[PDB]
Amino acid sequence: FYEESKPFTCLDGTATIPFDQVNDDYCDCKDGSDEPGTAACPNGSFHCTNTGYKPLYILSSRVNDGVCDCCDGTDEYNSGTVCENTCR
Numbered sequence: 001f002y003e004e005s006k007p008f009t010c011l012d013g014t015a016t017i018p019f020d021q022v023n024d025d026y027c028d029c030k031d032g033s034d035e036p037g038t039a040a041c042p043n044g045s046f047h048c049t050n051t052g053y054k055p056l057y058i059l060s061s062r063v064n065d066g067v068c069d070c071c072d073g074t075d076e077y078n079s080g081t082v083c084e085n086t087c088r
């Protein structure tokens with residue numbers, strides 16, 4: 001058996017971490033590139049896929065803040081606010 005855990009490198013080259021530190025809700029990269037799906041980095045961005053319509057990027061601090069930022073509502077996945085799809 002071959003152990004592939006080839007690690008993640010921050011898009012800014014500042015650190016190399018295992019992929020278990022990617023979206024682990026703690027900021028490990030100065031550019032925020034290890035936490036695209038959480039609110040952990042102060043300078044990160046969350047991608048609103050908005051399937052079928054124009055995609056948007058929001059501040060990471062708006063992920064699970066209880067406010068509906070993406071028209072698809074995907075920024076609110078564990079906050080208690082259930083967002084409706086308003087892309088149309």
Ligand SMILES: [Ca+2]
Nearest residue numbers: 021026028034
């Ligand atoms: Ca992390």
Ligand SMILES: [Ca+2]
Nearest residue numbers: 062067069075
């Ligand atoms: Ca939000």
